[PDB]
């Protein structure tokens with residue numbers, strides 16, 4: 001495209017993102033270019049060291065075989081690439097997940113990580129998918145949500161609710177009235193970056209935005225989802241709200257048009273780093289008092 005010219009430009013200087021990249025990413029990266037573009041966004045291009053390590057890691061046993069197997073059995077099992085249990089896709093998926101469990105000695109394999117691994121394997125080869133997965137967990141900071149009995153996740157829930165008070169006040173008020181807290185609905189959004197419940201078309205666009213702009217885009221998407229469906233939530237009771245989040249909400253985004261308007265709104269509902277850091281500080285101060 002425009003994409004072709006952009007990639008030529010980028011390859012003249014892989015150290016610096018071209019000025020028009022963020023605007024082109026906002027519209028969605030083409031499927032066939034995501035393998036390359038995701039690697040470049042994440043800052044790995046021929047990351048030889050991680051690939052060398054990976055080749056050793058795959059010879060080691062995982063102490064989390066059972067968790068990994070369970071997750072893989074629920075990871076896009078009908079998809080053409082993953083449906084053959086002896087296929088290359090499923091083989092690669094196991095190896096990546098096991099390798100990760102051995103690589104991150106402190107934390108190990110994280111529940112749901114197979115969905116993210118699978119998203120990456122849908123667009124690039126195995127060894128590169130491992131590399132990108134590591135960068136998402138370590139550099140972008142996904143693994144931080146799993147430390148300290150999920151303390152940073154709890155922080156994100158607090159942040160989401162403060163943002164809702166501000167940008168979706170009617171919905172915030174209603175959720176207060178029915179005592180529905182974010183931990184009851186937003187956990188998989190954050191911990192899996194939407195990979196575990198939303199349709200792939202939408203999920204790929206989310207990764208495009210997340211790799212370009214950072215892990216904070218989960219807030220933008222969260223607010224876009226809540227604002228778009230708020231009228232199906234405002235008059236519901238507790239059970240009703242949960243049922244909506246579990247069944248109807250992901251079903252809406254099977255439509256490509258619905259998913260495109262959602263990512264547009266998410267980008268438009270962008271939240272500043274300054275604002276997020278304020279709310280993070282508020283949460284930390286609060287936790288210190290009660291401690």
Ligand SMILES: [Cl-]
Pocket residue numbers: 270271272275
């Ligand atoms: Cl803002």
